[PDB]
């Protein structure tokens, strides 16, 4: 909420898609997602460690989170209840092929 009305948010993010992606997320997990997404944004500027002292007005004057930060953030936060569907998506890691008509009939049925 505050992020948007303070003009710190890129215009590219569309919330509906975010809601779509997060299947089994609980109400307490979305907040960590926000935190992680912001953490990437801020880290791009500071670069803790090696490239220190780059902090300056110009950098901090135009901070905005981007969509890909959230996409990256999905790799850190993981559901707690959506742990059995992962098995299902990995069951078809081998791919699928339609070498016969039959398969189409079966799936249709």
Partner 1 sequence: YSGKQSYLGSIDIDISFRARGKAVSTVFDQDELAKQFVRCYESQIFSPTQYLIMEFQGHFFDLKIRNVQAIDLGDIEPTSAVATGIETKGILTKQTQINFFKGRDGLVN
> Residues 52, 96, 97, 106: which binds partner 1 (CB under 8 A)?
52
56: helix, coil or strand? coil
Considering the complex, state which of residue 52 and residue 88 has its C-beta at the smaller distance from partner 1.
52
Whole-angstrom distance, CA of residue 3 vs CA of residue 12: 14
Q: How many residues bind partner 1 (CB under 8 A)?
A: 3
Start-to-end CA distance of the chain, whole Å, equals 46
Contact positions with partner 1 (CB under 8 A) in 60-99: none
CB of 54 vs partner 1, minimal distance in Å: 8
**In contact, 69 and 41? CB cutoff 8 Å:** yes
Asked if 105 touches partner 1 (CB under 8 A), the answer is: no
**Binding span for partner 1 by CB under 8 A among 2-10, 37-45, 51-59, 69-77:** 51-59
Q: Cα–Cα distances in Å, from 38 out to 43, 63, 71, 103?
A: 9, 10, 12, 46
**Residues in contact with partner 1 by the rule CB under 8 A:** 52-53, 56
């Amino acid at each position: 909420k505050k992020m948007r009305e303070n003009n710190m948010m890129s215009d590219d993010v569309n919330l509906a898609e975010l809601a779509a992606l997060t299947k089994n997320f609980s109400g307490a997990e979305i907040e960590g997602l926000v935190k992680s997404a912001s953490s990437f944004a801020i880290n791009k500027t500071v670069n803790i460690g090696k490239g220190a002292t780059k902090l300056n007005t110009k950098d901090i004057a135009k901070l905005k989170v981007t969509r890909e930060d959230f996409l990256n953030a999905l790799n850190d936060v993981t559901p707690a209840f959506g742990i059995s569907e992962e098995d299902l998506k990995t069951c078809v890691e081998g791919g699928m092929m339609l070498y016969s008509e039959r398969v189409n009939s079966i799936l249709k049925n």
